[PDB]
Design an enzyme around this catalytic site. Sequence first.
Site, PDB file in Angstrom:
ATOM      1  N   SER A 106       0.831  -1.204   0.000  1.00 33.07           N
ATOM      2  CA  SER A 106       0.000   0.000   0.000  1.00 33.07           C
ATOM      3  C   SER A 106       0.871   1.263   0.000  1.00 33.07           C
ATOM      4  O   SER A 106       0.668   2.149  -0.823  1.00 33.07           O
ATOM      5  CB  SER A 106      -1.025  -0.016   1.104  1.00 33.07           C
ATOM      6  OG  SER A 106      -0.480  -0.063   2.421  1.00 33.07           O
ATOM      7  N   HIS A 126      -2.255  -8.676   1.297  1.00 29.52           N
ATOM      8  CA  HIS A 126      -1.894  -7.474   2.016  1.00 29.52           C
ATOM      9  C   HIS A 126      -2.930  -7.087   3.069  1.00 29.52           C
ATOM     10  O   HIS A 126      -2.545  -6.687   4.166  1.00 29.52           O
ATOM     11  CB  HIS A 126      -1.541  -6.338   1.051  1.00 29.52           C
ATOM     12  CG  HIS A 126      -0.911  -5.174   1.755  1.00 29.52           C
ATOM     13  ND1 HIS A 126      -0.836  -3.887   1.252  1.00 29.52           N
ATOM     14  CD2 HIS A 126      -0.357  -5.130   2.970  1.00 29.52           C
ATOM     15  CE1 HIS A 126      -0.195  -3.128   2.117  1.00 29.52           C
ATOM     16  NE2 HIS A 126       0.091  -3.852   3.171  1.00 29.52           N
ATOM     17  N   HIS A 151       6.011 -13.362   8.083  1.00 31.50           N
ATOM     18  CA  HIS A 151       6.077 -12.054   7.472  1.00 31.50           C
ATOM     19  C   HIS A 151       7.241 -12.063   6.493  1.00 31.50           C
ATOM     20  O   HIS A 151       8.159 -12.889   6.613  1.00 31.50           O
ATOM     21  CB  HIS A 151       6.276 -10.977   8.548  1.00 31.50           C
ATOM     22  CG  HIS A 151       5.881  -9.605   8.103  1.00 31.50           C
ATOM     23  ND1 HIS A 151       6.754  -8.689   7.539  1.00 31.50           N
ATOM     24  CD2 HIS A 151       4.669  -9.017   8.126  1.00 31.50           C
ATOM     25  CE1 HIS A 151       6.064  -7.581   7.225  1.00 31.50           C
ATOM     26  NE2 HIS A 151       4.807  -7.757   7.587  1.00 31.50           N
ATOM     27  N   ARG A 205       3.643  -4.607  17.169  1.00 26.72           N
ATOM     28  CA  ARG A 205       2.262  -4.173  16.998  1.00 26.72           C
ATOM     29  C   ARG A 205       1.332  -5.231  17.592  1.00 26.72           C
ATOM     30  O   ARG A 205       0.307  -4.874  18.167  1.00 26.72           O
ATOM     31  CB  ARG A 205       1.923  -3.926  15.529  1.00 26.72           C
ATOM     32  CG  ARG A 205       2.819  -2.911  14.841  1.00 26.72           C
ATOM     33  CD  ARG A 205       2.569  -2.857  13.351  1.00 26.72           C
ATOM     34  NE  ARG A 205       2.669  -4.155  12.702  1.00 26.72           N
ATOM     35  CZ  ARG A 205       2.366  -4.377  11.421  1.00 26.72           C
ATOM     36  NH1 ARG A 205       1.914  -3.393  10.670  1.00 26.72           N
ATOM     37  NH2 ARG A 205       2.537  -5.574  10.884  1.00 26.72           N
TER      38      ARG A 205
END
Lengths: 434, 435, 434, 434
Positions: free
Chosen positions: B240, B270, B318, B327
Amino acid sequence: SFLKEKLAEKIAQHRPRTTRLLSEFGNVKIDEVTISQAIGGMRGIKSLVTDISYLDPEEGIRFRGYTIPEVLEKLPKVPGAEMPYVEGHFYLLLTGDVPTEKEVKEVAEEFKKRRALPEYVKDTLKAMPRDTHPMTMFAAGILAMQRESKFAAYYNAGKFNKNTAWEPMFEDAMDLMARLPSLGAYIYRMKYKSDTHIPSNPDLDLGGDFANMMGIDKPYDDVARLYFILHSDHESGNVSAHTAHLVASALSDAYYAYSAAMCGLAGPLHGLANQEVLKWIQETIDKKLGGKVPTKEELKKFVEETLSSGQVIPGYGHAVLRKTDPRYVAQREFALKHMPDDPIFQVVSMLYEVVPPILSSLGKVKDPWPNVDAHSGCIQWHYGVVEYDFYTVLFGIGRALGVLANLVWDRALGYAIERPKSVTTDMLEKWAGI
Amino acid sequence: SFLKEKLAEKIAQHRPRTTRLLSEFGNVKIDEVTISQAIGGMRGIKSLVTDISYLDPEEGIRFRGYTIPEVLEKLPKVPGAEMPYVEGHFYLLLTGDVPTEKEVKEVAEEFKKRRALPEYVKDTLKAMPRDTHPMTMFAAGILAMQRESKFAAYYNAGKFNKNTAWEPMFEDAMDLMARLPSLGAYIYRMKYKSDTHIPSNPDLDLGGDFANMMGIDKPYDDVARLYFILHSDHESGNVSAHTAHLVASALSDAYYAYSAAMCGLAGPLHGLANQEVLKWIQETIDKKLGGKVPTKEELKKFVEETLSSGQVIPGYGHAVLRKTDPRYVAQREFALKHMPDDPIFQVVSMLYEVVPPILSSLGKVKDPWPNVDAHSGCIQWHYGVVEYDFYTVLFGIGRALGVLANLVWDRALGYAIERPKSVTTDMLEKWAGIK
Amino acid sequence: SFLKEKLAEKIAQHRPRTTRLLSEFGNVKIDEVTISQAIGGMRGIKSLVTDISYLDPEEGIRFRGYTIPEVLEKLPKVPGAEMPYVEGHFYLLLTGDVPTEKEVKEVAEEFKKRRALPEYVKDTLKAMPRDTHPMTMFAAGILAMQRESKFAAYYNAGKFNKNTAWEPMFEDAMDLMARLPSLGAYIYRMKYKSDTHIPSNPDLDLGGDFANMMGIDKPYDDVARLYFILHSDHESGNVSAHTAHLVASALSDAYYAYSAAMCGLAGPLHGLANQEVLKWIQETIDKKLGGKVPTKEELKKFVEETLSSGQVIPGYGHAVLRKTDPRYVAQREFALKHMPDDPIFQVVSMLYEVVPPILSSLGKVKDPWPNVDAHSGCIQWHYGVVEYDFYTVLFGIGRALGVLANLVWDRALGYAIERPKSVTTDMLEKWAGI
Amino acid sequence: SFLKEKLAEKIAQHRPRTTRLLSEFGNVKIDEVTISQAIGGMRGIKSLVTDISYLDPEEGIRFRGYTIPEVLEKLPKVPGAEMPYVEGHFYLLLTGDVPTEKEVKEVAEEFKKRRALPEYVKDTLKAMPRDTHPMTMFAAGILAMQRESKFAAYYNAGKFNKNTAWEPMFEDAMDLMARLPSLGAYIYRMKYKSDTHIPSNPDLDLGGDFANMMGIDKPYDDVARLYFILHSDHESGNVSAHTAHLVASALSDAYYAYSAAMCGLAGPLHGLANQEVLKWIQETIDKKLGGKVPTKEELKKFVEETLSSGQVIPGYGHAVLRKTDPRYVAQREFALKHMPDDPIFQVVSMLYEVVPPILSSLGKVKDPWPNVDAHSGCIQWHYGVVEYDFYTVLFGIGRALGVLANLVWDRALGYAIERPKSVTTDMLEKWAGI
């Protein structure tokens, strides 16, 4: 379809080559990255793979190995017209093979079945303010049609298979490509021609039908066929093609991907050159050259003075091209045949002789030569497409031929999500030794 | 002080460094590219520069030098609430400075005067079929507002100046950021809450006003503050953010760039992992663990079954991360505090323990560890956001904080059009030496 | 206490009664059907069961065992108004209990959060031609909102369960009843008050907020409250209530069911007698009485001449009633108090004296007495609701209180699909001997 | 040759029959009513009169005296096609006569003239969210067109005459019948086929033009023609027809009446069994028989396990049929001819052998035989109508042929408002002696 079966052959032939490159040769170095390039938009980094087209800096673009003259000579013509079926160019980009007449006609028949624009696309475009830029409308139209996505339905239904994923991508590509010239024409009519519309003619080919719906007589049909093919692809690292590839790489469907691509193509450093050359020529004939075709001499000193000012000659230079754009050369031959006495063309041509010598010597530009954007506008203008902003939509329609073919293959070959690594300025200073 | 003056200060300090890097250290090599990388989506190639955030494989995301614990510690808090002003993280991503109370409230007040949606946005969304995917509607909302672009107006009037181009980009970034929560809330209400709408409340911060417009009580205001800050940036290389950057690099305005970004974020690879994790966990509690929180033992074996049976644990692994996503940790902290008993969270909690050892032992997935998506859904679900496809829109609102801050800086530093070179399979074979 | 849990308890009590009636007394005869009755609209046949209300031929309607005077006496009033909370009457119809002040305040709070009209309802109403009759707009608004049906989603998701089905139905009834006044008002404003709208006041009760949104000052709030209560139900055998029951018996949700009901209520023999009476009185005053109140004796002769020249007195007679309608009496008590000098009311009042004697004398009309429709119009006209077609919409808003309560119970008690048997004329001729 | 004149003849010779039954035989008893019936949805009570069709429990349905083999055999066939003009069936339902060629052509001409969809109907359906269920859309479309009602305008202008009223009702029935397939198709295109539309072919008959506008090739034109005739009526006691009759009884026009009907047809207990059968078969094939056409014995034991487990076999009972539905049998004949080897049909075909013996063996179901809904789905699916929710709209198109012909006759014979009497549970308890 014969097209889809032919493509499935090519895919089966191509796949082992890619697998072998990863299996045996994955670690072979092909390039380096410098600080310059990292700050400067990945300039020159060989980090993308496509087989749809390849942009030689010297010879220019080849489509599936062929030069532009080869493409225009070998592809079947539309009966009556000078130029190939655009459908046949699509066939070529998807498969690598020049289609026969029979094969092109099959594609043509299938585009006719897929050509209709969803009514809700019109509704959406009427709800957007009429004063919206047509590239915004064109991108919105594509995006709204994401609702129809067969790739997206296939993924969401849990049917994703890496061997098979290309198949719904192909269908989406066929659906989208068949409709893009109607979307563009609808925008043209709704904004610029009193919002009166001409029905799609179900007996015309893509280009001919586009000319029909725009409301422009022969030979605009050939103008468009020529235009669409020449703009069809310029490898995958240009902003629009790359954007589509990037977004598609996340398994976003082609509507999301090509909408996004048009957001990039609307960018002044990508889609606006055609009309900025035409304007600067027109503005040049107006002010400098007394409103007529000048002499080679008068022109000569206009350029020399322009350059010493600090000003630039629009539609000359490119970030990869280093010789004369062969897309320029084909536009030139169409003009020479069909509008030789057009004042704007004449200025274009004479710019052709004069401007290159004067700045290969100055030696300041890396590509002291014309790109296609130096020739496109005068042809459009000649036939009365005077609405500058719209020129980029024509580009958008054209470039879908290559880009959508590229997304089918990206999916065919299972190319991974594009996800490079970022570094900070501090990190750059570290490496530089500060 | 004034955000725009403060930014001008930072731009004037930063610009010499970039200049010196290009002028004196241009040709310093920083990486190589292999065949595997050209074919494999530029994986690992260091070819992008941003200062907004930096993703450390081992340590995770840092925003402007700071870890997430530091950010949540240092940013001024909304009076009466657990979490910081989303506006203050925007200030941080833009300037590199932690805002004082004065400074954050200035942003909060400036967003309040830029919140209202053009009415033609609502008209456009109604004309799109209501069965359109929320992310498609979100991208289209953003795209229609390109009619308002100050950057586009600036350029098209002939005013483009290299030094000052950042200023209209900033104004657009402020215009868009202010509106994105209202656009998302509009889409949520129109699709999923019977098309009744709760007006924006100008006495509320961004996150509070988001929960208000969505129609969700406290502490959803904090859920939202934290979510948006956590999702604000992941350096420039994620799809993005990269898409925004790519597009804007051709001098396309932020509406064009951020619409294009959301086309990428809508992708299954995504933007979907949150809802895929959640669906999986729910489908597991049902058809596999007898509608109940299992024992550490049963889950241990269920996981082992799934992996060996040829499948993946969602929300683990990931492309860049190689240890636990911090996070994820900040979400876990919120959940431990606010929903320790929630049965879905319990499975999420238990998976945290069980899965990393198992994945690691297999040595297959390079990141035998969870990412945020492992955690976000049980939190959303808890508070009644059941509409899975909308999770990606929450993501889009948050990710605009960093992406738009980055586009301002791209324009401030005059970063060139992104234009790498393609090569063909034939060329790779030549270089592979197989003629 | 909370409505839903009170309703739940009531349902638990009533079920065994129903179950016993069927297991043990299933074959007990309660009526017959004749040729007259098969041809004549099932007239008089005892073939429907409901407990919300019961129409007594001699005494009129009772709501949950109570007379109208009892309902208006016992139901909590809106602080500082004359009439009950409409929300409180709803509680009564759903449960059979007069609610306390505390219990009604809880229904009013819940109605405030359910009051907002979906924006697509007003998009649909604007797409419909503005010259559409307001009851068509009303039925369409209800029908569009079946998109939101919790009962429908419950069914579609496979969760249907004989025991719990009433729960989604209750939720839908609460959602719809909360919105109906708002839908009504929007139609009134969009058609007849220049399309300017007054926003809902979230501190007002159903009745007060309806008057607010309509644009009509006090005491039209009490006019409304009383109107809605009086029209709330008339057993289940009237066309509109029966339509909703029939439709829902096929497990259609309340939006489909109540929309269909409004299709019945729009009919000239069901929904129009209010306006027909008022138009008749107004013509009578203007032409036949020189625009001036007549004398008891002047009107007595006008009535006689109208009857003996093959016309009917509108608003007198009923299919089931056989005495004065208590709903008429309630309108009269309101009018006596609030508008005694109203000319139109003065004719209505004298007609009450003069007409029944004359109708009973001629002995043709089985119910020589007024029904509610004889009285409703003169009140509405007095407060400036002159838009005759709209009066039916008022009827629709009110009748939903008992009908939606009835659907909740229909599904609580698992009432089967309604499916009587048809015969032909030939078969009636056979029954009769030819 | 004129339908309207023929229908006036038929009304003139029918009216004395009705009159006489009321005058002389009004009091003859034709049925009883028990507690079980009043609680259980009027089950079995003979309380409705129609002549359009009659449902014999053993013979199944007769249209105007004729069986389905007889209708299909005697109605004039569309040239080039296998099946009768749908228009010819409407002629039969209206007049009781089988039309000549001249007669059917006249009706086909009239529908060609009346067939066009009002633009505001499309407007309305676009302003309704696209995610609304197609039956909600279908019902709204019909409802919006009450704007055009001739019957309503005739009433409103004071022209109502009980001898003459059938005449504008006929006009509304012709108008609406001509248009319903275009409404259905529009809904199908706009929801499921990317919102592109195929224009009406003015040279096609109703069934052929439906298949045209749906975008489905021959022989779907015959599928539709047969489907519509088969679904045309099932006397007046089914929920959809009854609802239309009930609403119409209050002198609501056909648009209000057929709208309300489709609210009832939408109900899971009336409109869904086609869908629900086809899905159950599909799911069974996939889950239970490993994705293959099973053996007769594999399926038999499957039925036995399903039935003994307390789960039901869909499409094999009925509230009125006690023997095999001849509607089912005509579907089977078509499939036998046109899709022998279709796997879903094979399973349907084997079910017809296997299920009835097993079902009567346990002797719990009153009708151990298929209804039409067991067969319709495999045929729609064969031809690519995969959108399950849309099947009920096909039903709605079909059923209008009978219902509207009935509303014309209801008004011709001046049948009264339907208004039975309600009773309470207490009242049932007294009668029982509790």
